[PDB]
Amino acid sequence: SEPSPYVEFDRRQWRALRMSTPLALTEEELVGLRGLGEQIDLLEVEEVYLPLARLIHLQVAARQRLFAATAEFLGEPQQNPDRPVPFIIGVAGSVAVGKSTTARVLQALLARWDHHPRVDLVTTDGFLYPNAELQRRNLMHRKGFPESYNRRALMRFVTSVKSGSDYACAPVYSHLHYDIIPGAEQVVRHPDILILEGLNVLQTGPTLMVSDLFDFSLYVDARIEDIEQWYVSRFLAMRTTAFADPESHFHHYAAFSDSQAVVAAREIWRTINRPNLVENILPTRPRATLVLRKDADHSINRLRLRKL
Amino acid sequence: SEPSPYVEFDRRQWRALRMSTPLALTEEELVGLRGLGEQIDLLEVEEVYLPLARLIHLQVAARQRLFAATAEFLGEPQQNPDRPVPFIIGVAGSVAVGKSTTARVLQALLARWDHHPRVDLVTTDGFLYPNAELQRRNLMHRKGFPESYNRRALMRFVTSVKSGSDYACAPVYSHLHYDIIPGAEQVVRHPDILILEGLNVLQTGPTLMVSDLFDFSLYVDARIEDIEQWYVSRFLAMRTTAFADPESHFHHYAAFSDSQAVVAAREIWRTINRPNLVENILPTRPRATLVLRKDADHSINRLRLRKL
Ligand SMILES: CC(C)(COP(=O)(O)OP(=O)(O)OC[C@H]1O[C@@H](n2cnc3c(N)ncnc32)[C@H](O)[C@@H]1OP(=O)(O)O)[C@@H](O)C(=O)NCCC(=O)NCCSSCCO
Ligand SMILES: CC(C)(COP(=O)(O)OP(=O)(O)OC[C@H]1O[C@@H](n2cnc3c(N)ncnc32)[C@H](O)[C@@H]1OP(=O)(O)O)[C@@H](O)C(=O)NCCC(=O)NCCSSCCO
């Protein structure tokens, strides 16, 4: 009889909350959404993601009445073709934990609902300072840490979108060139649902931050030991993948041998990513609305929901 | 064209948001609710508090649909006589800023609405460890700081109430005896609205805290210089008030002269309360849903609302 803000589910119980929700995704489309190293299949989409999509849509509708109440108080006009306040979803997790895939799969699913919602996906890597500013601030070795992002611009972007602005722009990042793409821009136009995915997104602070504007948040979790192993493996697999293309900022890596690669990946992990995870990311897991616990084989078998 | 999560109002503009809301409080009743040193009159109740009560009730109704959505997702029965999820309001501010009064006035106003809501008020001083445990943990000089409260019990209490438990108990504190009253208990029974008032209430942490369960929060603000002066004045006025009664843990103070008192109050303030304000309380003001800015004369002339 010890009340809790959380409710924990094993996959076998969570799958039942799917109810009647239709599966509108083919094994073909899932393939194009799957990230390097991910093992998600159609069954996992069905037993884990479908009930997630249902939970979200139930909340989107209810969350709108809350903002409408504030609008009615201020006496601000609900004029023209009524445009809903965007619903903002934060997706966080460590590097290589698979949050990229999760965000993409969730977008596809959320968009294929009867009322055809406009669902955008924005990765926060577009707000990392360009390498120039990075090495000009002596932060090239802290890329991924909270200080490597233009927190002001990020906050300004999300505030703009949720305030109901007609359009807002976000910088575009290129993982290949390991840097910001000069002049490139992603345009977001009053979406019904905006999904923001990144390492930092749930970070709280002495000031109001982007996480305070989230209407729902998910954390992609795994044992730190397992994440390290996925990191190292994706690293090796990239030698014949991204590191292959000459433009790659890490071409010199595509040549490494299985032995050197492992030693190289583990250090980058030990000195840069692991510290960031432990110090900045893991501390936000307690506040996430929904935690997705992955197992050694990438499979999500456990979930923790905040009902309070 | 710089979007903001905040909206600032001068009293003259805020007063207009009262709309038709009836004033159901007499100057007589207001007298009994007013704390030592407070200057709140019926006009202030009308121009500042009435629109506040209206904002809250508009939100109470909308907030219920949100929890209902989660309930519908989990497939949990909306059985019997439908009992709403309690709406939790946090009221924070420094010592002597006047938050006690604000909380009491707000309770009275919220309760006198057409549907007769059950509105309870719980001060968190009932969760301060007894002086015994305090001096047993070497914290008697940090009374009021976050470490002086039983954060676990406080969180357990609020979680219990909002989870829908039939009843929950909170310890009772006695300002006179400067300590917890052994055996005394305040019983809270599934209220429609629960108001929690204290110094710590908005504190965030590495773990889920009481502030994460709040549905609305207000911060009672004033210039630190002015708060210091109110502290010192209330102190002097208490010599002939509370410090008079022999039981008072500070009887020896009722004898002090205007000169000594001032020097004594200022040090307690300088060494205990001011530090707590600067280090633990002020840092939470950015997250409060509504900030009430008091002026040197205790009058509230400015407000800052989070519409996002
Ligand atoms: C740039 C930054 C901060 C980006 O963080 P993210 O949260 O986006 O990383 P995350 O693991 O989520 O990857 C997101 C996507 O970005 C992909 N990606 C990551 N690094 C590269 C890359 N170098 N080239 C091409 N694609 C890449 C990754 O495979 C995901 O794509 P898929 O959804 O198709 O699978 C991080 O990857 C980084 O480089 N941190 C500095 C420390 C470090 O790891 N240095 C070694 C760089 S080469 S090893 C590649 C794995 O880090
Ligand atoms: C015990 C504690 C933590 C309580 O914090 P609170 O947030 O409840 O203080 P706050 O200023 O909000 O006072 C709440 C009510 O509690 C009243 N009060 C405060 N101290 C006493 C007292 N000693 N005797 C009787 N009533 C008191 C105060 O007048 C308010 O009543 P009203 O609503 O009728 O005006 C704080 O007052 C304290 O004693 N902190 C330790 C440092 C300190 O100030 N020591 C000097 C104690 S004698 S000076 C009285 C003002 O502090």
Short mmCIF file of C-alpha atoms in Angstrom, two decimals, chain A:
data_model
loop_
_atom_site.label_atom_id
_atom_site.label_comp_id
_atom_site.label_asym_id
_atom_site.label_seq_id
_atom_site.Cartn_x
_atom_site.Cartn_y
_atom_site.Cartn_z
CA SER A 1 0.00 0.00 0.00
CA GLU A 2 2.90 2.30 -0.90
CA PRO A 3 1.58 4.80 -3.53
CA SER A 4 3.89 5.63 -6.43
CA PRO A 5 4.01 8.21 -9.24
CA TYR A 6 5.26 5.39 -11.48
CA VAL A 7 3.67 2.29 -12.97
CA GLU A 8 5.96 -0.44 -14.27
CA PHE A 9 5.07 -2.81 -17.07
CA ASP A 10 6.65 -5.85 -18.56
CA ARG A 11 6.24 -5.98 -22.34
CA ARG A 12 3.69 -8.82 -22.03
CA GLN A 13 1.34 -6.61 -20.05
CA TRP A 14 2.01 -3.39 -21.92
CA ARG A 15 1.17 -5.02 -25.28
CA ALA A 16 -2.45 -5.43 -24.17
CA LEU A 17 -2.96 -1.64 -24.06
CA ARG A 18 -2.91 -1.61 -27.84
CA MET A 19 -6.67 -2.16 -27.92
CA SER A 20 -8.01 -1.71 -31.44
CA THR A 21 -5.21 0.51 -32.79
CA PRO A 22 -4.39 -0.45 -36.44
CA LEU A 23 -0.86 -1.26 -37.61
CA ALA A 24 -0.27 1.13 -40.51
CA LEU A 25 3.38 0.29 -41.14
CA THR A 26 4.90 -2.36 -43.42
CA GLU A 27 8.06 -4.35 -42.78
CA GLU A 28 9.44 -2.55 -45.85
CA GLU A 29 8.94 0.95 -44.43
CA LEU A 30 10.30 -0.14 -41.06
CA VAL A 31 13.54 -1.11 -42.82
CA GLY A 32 14.09 2.42 -44.07
CA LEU A 33 13.45 3.86 -40.60
CA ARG A 34 15.80 1.47 -38.77
CA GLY A 35 19.17 2.86 -37.68
CA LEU A 36 22.55 1.16 -37.96
CA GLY A 37 22.67 -1.60 -35.35
CA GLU A 38 18.99 -1.51 -34.38
CA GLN A 39 17.01 -4.76 -34.19
CA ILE A 40 13.45 -3.43 -34.06
CA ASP A 41 10.99 -5.60 -36.01
CA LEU A 42 7.29 -5.32 -36.76
CA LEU A 43 6.36 -7.30 -33.64
CA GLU A 44 8.12 -4.79 -31.38
CA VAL A 45 6.41 -1.95 -33.22
CA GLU A 46 3.12 -3.70 -32.49
CA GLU A 47 3.61 -4.68 -28.86
CA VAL A 48 5.56 -1.61 -27.73
CA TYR A 49 5.04 1.35 -30.05
CA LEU A 50 1.36 1.02 -30.96
CA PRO A 51 0.20 1.38 -27.35
CA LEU A 52 2.64 4.30 -27.07
CA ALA A 53 1.06 6.05 -30.05
CA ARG A 54 -2.37 5.49 -28.52
CA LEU A 55 -1.32 6.97 -25.16
CA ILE A 56 0.05 10.05 -26.89
CA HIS A 57 -2.99 10.78 -29.05
CA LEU A 58 -5.24 10.44 -26.04
CA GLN A 59 -3.10 13.06 -24.32
CA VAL A 60 -2.74 15.43 -27.28
CA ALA A 61 -6.46 16.14 -27.27
CA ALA A 62 -6.62 16.67 -23.48
CA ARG A 63 -3.52 18.88 -23.38
CA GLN A 64 -5.17 21.31 -25.83
CA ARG A 65 -8.05 22.05 -23.44
CA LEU A 66 -5.48 23.11 -20.84
CA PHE A 67 -3.91 25.78 -23.06
CA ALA A 68 -7.37 26.83 -24.24
CA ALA A 69 -8.27 27.49 -20.58
CA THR A 70 -5.34 29.89 -20.23
CA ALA A 71 -6.34 31.53 -23.51
CA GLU A 72 -9.91 31.99 -22.28
CA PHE A 73 -8.58 33.58 -19.10
CA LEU A 74 -6.44 36.08 -20.99
CA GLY A 75 -9.37 36.84 -23.27
CA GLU A 76 -7.26 36.17 -26.37
CA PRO A 77 -9.24 35.46 -29.60
CA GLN A 78 -9.69 31.83 -30.71
CA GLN A 79 -10.00 33.33 -34.21
CA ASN A 80 -9.84 32.19 -37.86
CA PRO A 81 -9.41 28.51 -38.63
CA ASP A 82 -8.65 27.31 -35.09
CA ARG A 83 -4.99 26.28 -34.90
CA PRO A 84 -4.06 24.01 -31.93
CA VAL A 85 -1.11 24.71 -29.69
CA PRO A 86 1.64 22.36 -30.85
CA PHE A 87 2.19 19.32 -28.61
CA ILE A 88 5.92 18.95 -27.92
CA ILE A 89 7.56 15.58 -27.35
CA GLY A 90 11.08 15.20 -26.07
CA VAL A 91 13.04 12.04 -26.87
CA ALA A 92 16.29 11.57 -24.98
CA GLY A 93 18.95 8.95 -24.36
CA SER A 94 22.67 8.24 -24.65
CA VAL A 95 24.64 8.10 -27.90
CA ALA A 96 24.07 4.76 -29.70
CA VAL A 97 21.18 3.75 -27.39
CA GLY A 98 18.87 3.91 -30.41
CA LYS A 99 16.90 7.11 -29.73
CA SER A 100 17.18 8.20 -33.38
CA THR A 101 15.24 5.17 -34.56
CA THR A 102 12.69 5.48 -31.77
CA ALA A 103 11.97 9.08 -32.74
CA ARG A 104 11.58 8.24 -36.44
CA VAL A 105 9.32 5.26 -35.80
CA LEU A 106 7.19 7.33 -33.46
CA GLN A 107 6.81 10.10 -36.02
CA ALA A 108 5.59 7.73 -38.74
CA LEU A 109 3.08 6.11 -36.39
CA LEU A 110 1.76 9.39 -35.00
CA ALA A 111 1.20 10.77 -38.49
CA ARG A 112 -0.89 7.85 -39.74
CA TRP A 113 -3.90 8.51 -37.55
CA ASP A 114 -7.43 9.11 -38.83
CA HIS A 115 -7.27 12.91 -38.58
CA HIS A 116 -3.93 13.12 -40.44
CA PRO A 117 -1.85 15.22 -37.99
CA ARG A 118 1.16 17.24 -39.13
CA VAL A 119 4.08 15.67 -37.23
CA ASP A 120 7.60 17.08 -37.50
CA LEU A 121 10.87 15.68 -36.24
CA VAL A 122 13.80 17.90 -35.31
CA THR A 123 17.11 16.55 -34.01
CA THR A 124 18.96 18.92 -31.67
CA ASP A 125 22.33 18.27 -33.27
CA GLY A 126 21.35 21.14 -35.54
CA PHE A 127 21.91 23.38 -32.52
CA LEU A 128 25.47 22.26 -31.79
CA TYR A 129 27.81 25.20 -32.28
CA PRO A 130 29.75 24.86 -35.54
CA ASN A 131 33.17 23.28 -35.02
CA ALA A 132 34.63 26.75 -35.53
CA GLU A 133 32.89 28.22 -32.48
CA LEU A 134 33.60 24.94 -30.67
CA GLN A 135 37.38 25.07 -31.02
CA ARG A 136 37.12 28.84 -30.53
CA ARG A 137 35.57 28.14 -27.13
CA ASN A 138 37.87 25.20 -26.46
CA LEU A 139 35.05 22.64 -26.47
CA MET A 140 35.88 20.30 -29.36
CA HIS A 141 36.51 17.53 -26.82
CA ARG A 142 33.15 18.17 -25.11
CA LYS A 143 30.99 17.84 -28.22
CA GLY A 144 27.67 16.46 -27.02
CA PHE A 145 27.90 18.04 -23.59
CA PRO A 146 25.34 20.76 -22.71
CA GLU A 147 27.91 23.52 -23.35
CA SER A 148 28.34 22.45 -26.97
CA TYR A 149 24.77 23.45 -27.85
CA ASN A 150 23.34 26.90 -28.47
CA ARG A 151 20.81 26.55 -25.63
CA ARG A 152 19.46 30.04 -26.36
CA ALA A 153 18.63 29.33 -30.00
CA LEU A 154 17.16 25.93 -29.14
CA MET A 155 14.89 27.50 -26.52
CA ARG A 156 13.97 30.31 -28.87
CA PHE A 157 13.02 27.80 -31.59
CA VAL A 158 10.75 25.67 -29.42
CA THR A 159 9.19 28.74 -27.78
CA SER A 160 8.47 30.16 -31.23
CA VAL A 161 6.78 27.00 -32.49
CA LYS A 162 4.65 26.48 -29.38
CA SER A 163 3.71 30.18 -29.31
CA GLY A 164 1.96 29.63 -32.63
CA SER A 165 4.32 31.37 -35.02
CA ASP A 166 3.72 30.68 -38.73
CA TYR A 167 7.21 29.26 -39.25
CA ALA A 168 10.48 28.73 -37.42
CA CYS A 169 13.87 27.60 -38.69
CA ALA A 170 16.43 25.23 -37.23
CA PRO A 171 20.01 24.73 -38.38
CA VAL A 172 20.90 21.49 -40.15
CA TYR A 173 23.73 19.24 -39.00
CA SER A 174 25.65 16.73 -41.13
CA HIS A 175 26.97 13.64 -39.33
CA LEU A 176 29.21 12.91 -42.29
CA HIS A 177 31.10 16.21 -42.24
CA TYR A 178 30.90 16.15 -38.44
CA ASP A 179 29.75 19.78 -38.55
CA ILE A 180 26.95 22.29 -39.22
CA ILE A 181 25.97 22.78 -42.87
CA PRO A 182 26.43 26.51 -43.62
CA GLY A 183 23.20 28.06 -44.86
CA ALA A 184 21.07 24.92 -44.63
CA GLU A 185 17.79 25.22 -42.74
CA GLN A 186 14.88 23.03 -41.69
CA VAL A 187 11.56 24.85 -41.77
CA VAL A 188 8.88 23.89 -39.28
CA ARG A 189 5.36 25.25 -39.92
CA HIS A 190 2.81 25.10 -37.05
CA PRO A 191 2.82 21.27 -36.62
CA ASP A 192 0.22 19.49 -34.52
CA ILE A 193 3.04 17.54 -32.97
CA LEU A 194 6.72 18.41 -32.80
CA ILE A 195 9.22 15.72 -31.76
CA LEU A 196 12.61 16.97 -30.51
CA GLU A 197 15.30 14.33 -30.25
CA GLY A 198 18.71 14.74 -28.66
CA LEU A 199 21.10 14.01 -25.78
CA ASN A 200 20.36 17.21 -23.84
CA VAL A 201 16.61 17.76 -24.32
CA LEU A 202 15.58 16.75 -20.77
CA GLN A 203 18.23 18.83 -19.00
CA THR A 204 16.80 21.12 -16.32
CA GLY A 205 18.47 24.34 -15.20
CA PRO A 206 18.64 27.51 -13.03
CA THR A 207 16.63 29.07 -15.84
CA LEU A 208 13.57 27.98 -17.82
CA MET A 209 14.62 25.44 -20.43
CA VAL A 210 13.31 23.49 -23.36
CA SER A 211 12.38 20.51 -21.14
CA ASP A 212 9.93 22.80 -19.29
CA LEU A 213 7.98 23.23 -22.51
CA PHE A 214 7.61 19.50 -23.20
CA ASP A 215 4.12 18.01 -23.04
CA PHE A 216 5.48 14.45 -23.00
CA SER A 217 8.96 12.97 -22.75
CA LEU A 218 10.52 9.57 -23.33
CA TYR A 219 13.91 8.30 -22.24
CA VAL A 220 15.58 5.44 -24.12
CA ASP A 221 17.40 3.43 -21.49
CA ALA A 222 19.81 0.48 -21.41
CA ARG A 223 22.54 -0.82 -19.09
CA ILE A 224 25.54 1.48 -19.47
CA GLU A 225 27.70 -1.61 -20.07
CA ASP A 226 25.48 -2.66 -23.00
CA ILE A 227 25.41 0.83 -24.53
CA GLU A 228 29.22 0.87 -24.50
CA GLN A 229 29.22 -2.39 -26.46
CA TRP A 230 26.74 -1.08 -29.05
CA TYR A 231 28.84 2.03 -29.45
CA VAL A 232 31.99 0.02 -30.09
CA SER A 233 30.15 -2.28 -32.55
CA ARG A 234 28.53 0.51 -34.55
CA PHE A 235 31.96 2.13 -34.67
CA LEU A 236 33.50 -0.97 -36.29
CA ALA A 237 30.58 -1.37 -38.67
CA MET A 238 30.99 2.24 -39.79
CA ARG A 239 34.44 1.55 -41.23
CA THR A 240 32.76 -0.04 -44.24
CA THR A 241 29.84 2.40 -43.99
CA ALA A 242 30.11 6.13 -43.34
CA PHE A 243 33.86 6.18 -42.71
CA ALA A 244 34.17 4.80 -46.24
CA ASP A 245 32.99 7.90 -48.11
CA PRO A 246 36.08 10.16 -48.54
CA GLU A 247 34.15 13.23 -47.36
CA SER A 248 33.72 11.58 -43.98
CA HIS A 249 35.45 13.57 -41.27
CA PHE A 250 36.67 10.16 -40.07
CA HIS A 251 37.87 8.58 -43.31
CA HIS A 252 41.21 7.75 -41.69
CA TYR A 253 39.17 5.41 -39.50
CA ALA A 254 37.80 3.25 -42.32
CA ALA A 255 41.34 1.87 -42.54
CA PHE A 256 41.63 0.80 -38.90
CA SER A 257 41.80 -2.89 -38.10
CA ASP A 258 39.36 -4.66 -35.80
CA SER A 259 41.99 -4.39 -33.04
CA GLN A 260 42.80 -0.67 -33.27
CA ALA A 261 39.22 0.38 -33.88
CA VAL A 262 38.06 -1.25 -30.65
CA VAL A 263 40.82 0.48 -28.67
CA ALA A 264 39.98 3.81 -30.34
CA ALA A 265 36.22 3.58 -29.88
CA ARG A 266 36.52 2.57 -26.23
CA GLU A 267 38.64 5.61 -25.39
CA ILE A 268 36.34 8.10 -27.13
CA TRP A 269 33.60 6.39 -25.18
CA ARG A 270 35.54 6.32 -21.91
CA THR A 271 36.68 9.93 -22.15
CA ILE A 272 33.77 11.70 -23.89
CA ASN A 273 30.45 9.86 -24.18
CA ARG A 274 30.36 7.79 -20.99
CA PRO A 275 31.08 10.86 -18.80
CA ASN A 276 28.36 12.87 -20.56
CA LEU A 277 25.89 10.01 -20.03
CA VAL A 278 26.64 9.65 -16.32
CA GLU A 279 26.87 13.36 -15.52
CA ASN A 280 24.28 14.95 -17.77
CA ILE A 281 21.92 12.39 -19.28
CA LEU A 282 21.16 9.67 -16.69
CA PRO A 283 20.20 12.32 -14.10
CA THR A 284 17.12 13.24 -16.18
CA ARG A 285 15.67 9.74 -16.44
CA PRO A 286 13.60 10.18 -13.24
CA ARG A 287 11.53 12.97 -14.82
CA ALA A 288 10.78 11.34 -18.15
CA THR A 289 7.09 10.54 -18.70
CA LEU A 290 8.00 7.16 -20.16
CA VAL A 291 11.23 5.18 -19.89
CA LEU A 292 11.88 2.46 -22.50
CA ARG A 293 14.27 -0.12 -21.07
CA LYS A 294 16.27 -1.94 -23.75
CA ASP A 295 17.94 -5.30 -23.18
CA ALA A 296 21.34 -6.52 -24.38
CA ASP A 297 19.76 -7.55 -27.70
CA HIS A 298 18.23 -4.08 -28.29
CA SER A 299 14.77 -5.46 -27.59
CA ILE A 300 12.53 -3.29 -25.36
CA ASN A 301 11.02 -5.54 -22.71
CA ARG A 302 10.28 -3.09 -19.93
CA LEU A 303 8.53 0.21 -19.48
CA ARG A 304 8.01 2.73 -16.69
CA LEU A 305 5.19 5.23 -16.98
CA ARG A 306 4.60 8.33 -14.86
CA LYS A 307 0.88 8.48 -14.12
CA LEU A 308 1.63 11.36 -11.76
#
